[PDB]
Amino acid sequence: QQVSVRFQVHYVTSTDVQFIAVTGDHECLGRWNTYIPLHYNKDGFWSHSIFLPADTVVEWKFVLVENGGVTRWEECSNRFLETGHEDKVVHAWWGIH
Numbered sequence: 001q002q003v004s005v006r007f008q009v010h011y012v013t014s015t016d017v018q019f020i021a022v023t024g025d026h027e028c029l030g031r032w033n034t035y036i037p038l039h040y041n042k043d044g045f046w047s048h049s050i051f052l053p054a055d056t057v058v059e060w061k062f063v064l065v066e067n068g069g070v071t072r073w074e075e076c077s078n079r080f081l082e083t084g085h086e087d088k089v090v091h092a093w094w095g096i097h
């Protein structure tokens with residue numbers, strides 16, 4: 001079974017070709033090699049909903065992406081997420097567990 005998790009972070013980019021994405025240790029998160037782009041909303045928020053395996057534990061990070069690759073990793077250690085089995089929002093602050 002799957003669960004829908006909405007990731008959200010505030011980040012002001014400098015140019016229109018940069019964007020924020022999520023990556024992590026699960027296949028659904030790119031296995032640290034690829035990333036899932038977030039989308040920009042009103043008020044400088046980046047948000048997107050990702051389907052994750054239910055009732056498990058995954059490690060992940062926000063990344064900043066430009067010209068096809070990560071130009072900046074979040075400076076904290078890997079974050080842990082208990083995915084649960086109810087749809088939910090994970091609001092985070094860049095660089096802070």
Ligand SMILES: OC[C@H]1O[C@H](O[C@H]2[C@H](O)[C@@H](O)[C@@H](O[C@H]3[C@H](O)[C@@H](O)[C@@H](O[C@H]4[C@H](O)[C@@H](O)[C@@H](O)O[C@@H]4CO)O[C@@H]3CO)O[C@@H]2CO)[C@H](O)[C@@H](O)[C@@H]1O
Nearest residue numbers: 024025031032033059060061072073074075076077078079
């Ligand atoms: O064998 C492959 C490894 O795969 C996994 O490692 C992951 C890490 O868990 C992830 O966190 C990420 O690593 C990023 C890291 O998050 C990021 O901060 C950056 O680390 C740099 C850092 O800028 C700086 O301190 C510099 O000195 O070097 C650091 C490490 O290179 O970049 C890292 C990625 O390059 O992704 C890696 C895999 O790419 C797994 O957990 C490991 O056990 C495994 O060895």
Ligand SMILES: OC[C@H]1O[C@H](O[C@H]2[C@H](O)[C@@H](O)[C@@H](O[C@H]3[C@H](O)[C@@H](O)[C@@H](O[C@H]4[C@H](O)[C@@H](O)[C@@H](O)O[C@@H]4CO)O[C@@H]3CO)O[C@@H]2CO)[C@H](O)[C@@H](O)[C@@H]1O
Nearest residue numbers: 009010011012013014044064072074075092093094095096
């Ligand atoms: O003592 C620690 C720090 O305390 C204070 O920092 C505050 C900021 O003032 C707050 O605005 C917020 O910071 C957020 C920020 O709002 C959010 O946009 C994002 O910042 C990005 C930035 O948009 C982007 O352009 C790029 O430059 O990187 C930034 C992150 O590195 O995330 C920030 C936090 O992750 O909260 C912090 C406290 O956590 C004080 O102003 C700092 O000088 C001080 O170091």
